[PDB]
Design a protein around this ligand. Structure first.
Ligand SMILES: [Cl-]
Ligand SMILES: [Cl-]
Ligand code: NA
Length: 129
């Protein structure tokens, strides 16, 4: 599914991401925009053989099992395919663990390069929560 911007903000807000670990809702919308273009079905293969999955491009090296990433961990304890559902609950729950691990949202390369230090509040303006 391809989310609308406000639609996604509302879904993220319901799942407790607004100000989760100090990151306002605009940060998460911005990250999803540039990681996946708001597409829950997005996949991208990394050079090391791992693959990124879903709306926040969560990586099979550490976070999910795709059965084809030798020597990897499954820290969110889920198959990587569950991160491709139109229900975003699994992505959000895994993202909360990732963002708590010490590096905050710097784990998402697009966020660090394209959202960090910008007016992220712009991403939720005009939205009905
Ligand atoms: Cl929308
Ligand atoms: Cl894995
Ligand atoms: Na932080």
């Amino acid at each position: 599914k391809v989310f609308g911007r406000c639609e996604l903000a509302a879904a993220m807000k319901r799942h407790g991401l607004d100000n989760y670990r100090g990151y306002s809702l605009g940060n998460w919308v911005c990250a999803a925009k540039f990681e996946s273009n708001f597409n829950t079905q997005a996949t991208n293969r990394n050079t090391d053989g791992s693959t990124d999955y879903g709306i926040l491009q969560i990586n099979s090296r550490w976070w999910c099992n795709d059965g084809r990433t030798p020597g990897s961990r499954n820290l969110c304890n889920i198959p990587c395919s569950a991160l491709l559902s139109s229900d975003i609950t699994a992505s959000v729950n895994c993202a909360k663990k990732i963002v708590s691990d010490g590096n905050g949202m710097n784990a998402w390369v697009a966020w660090r390069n394209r959202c960090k230090g910008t007016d992220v509040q712009a991403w939720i303006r005009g939205c009905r929560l």
